[PDB]
Structure 1
Amino acid sequence: HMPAFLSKLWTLVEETHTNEFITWSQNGQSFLVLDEQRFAKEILPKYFKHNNMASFVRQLNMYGFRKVVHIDSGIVKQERDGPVEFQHPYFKQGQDDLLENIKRKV
């Protein structure tokens, strides 16, 4: 009864064997994608019918996830990418009961 995207996202983020690529941020308030490229080509196709980060991000925004922006505020590197962080008020570590409040947009 819960959309497949949301149940798969929870599993993804929660599952320890994926934590190198996708995991909870340090205070359970958001999830991280640590290695976008290996995530997209190895992890995504095991759960979805694609290997495109763009199509994963589309879904995130569709369910109202928002990217957490980190900027540089200082020195620029240029020698390291990302990582990528997304947040939703009802996608929270050790509160899976909140997931039912997440709603697709249109």
Structure 2
Amino acid sequence: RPAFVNKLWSMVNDKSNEKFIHWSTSGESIVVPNRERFVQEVLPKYFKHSNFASFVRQLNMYGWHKVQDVKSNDSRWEFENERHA
């Protein structure tokens, strides 16, 4: 499995990252309460020289898309995948 798939899997499951990135109670989406915190505290642990933009691009390559359910907190990010039951 691709390094990115491995990394995302480990990052969202690893208990030490729970306040920055974790599964929704249904497992349907990955929740990132605060992008800045996530970028500062988790990304550097899995990637060498990367940013949220690069992260989001990689996520797309694997079918993950940003959920747009806000009716006009830009800090909160949530991703769901194109493929589901």
Task: Looking at secondary structure, tell me which structure has more strand per residue.
Answer: 2
Q: Give the C-alpha shift of residue 51 in structure 1.
A: 4.1
TM-score (norm 1): 0.71
Conserved in 2, the CA contact under 8 Å of 1:44 and 1:50? no
Moved over 4 A (4+): none
Mapping of 1:13-52 within 5 angstroms? 13-52=12-51
- Aligned partner letter, 2:5: L
TM-score (norm 2): 0.86
Q: Give the C-alpha shift of residue 9 in structure 1.
A: 0.3
- Per-residue CA deviations over 1:19-78 (Å, capped at 9, x if unaligned) read 100010121111011110011122101101124111100101111211111112xxx5xx
- Aligned partner letter, 2:46: Y
State how many pairs are aligned.
Answer: 83
81, 86, 96: which is aligned to 2:79?
Answer: 86
Query: Distance in 2 between the 1:25 and 1:60 partners?
Result: 17
If you compute each CA radius of gyration, which structure gives the higher value, 1 or 2? 1
Conserved in 2, the CA contact under 8 Å of 1:40 and 1:53? yes
Partner of 2:53: 54
Q: 3-state DSSP class of the match of 2:47?
A: coil
Tell whether 2:10 aligns with 1:11: yes
RMSD: 1.5
Partner of 1:99: none
Query: Distance in 2 between the 1:52 and 1:14 partners?
Result: 20
- Aligned partner letter, 2:6: S
- Aligned partner letter, 2:57: R
Q: Give the C-alpha shift of residue 18 in structure 1.
A: 0.3
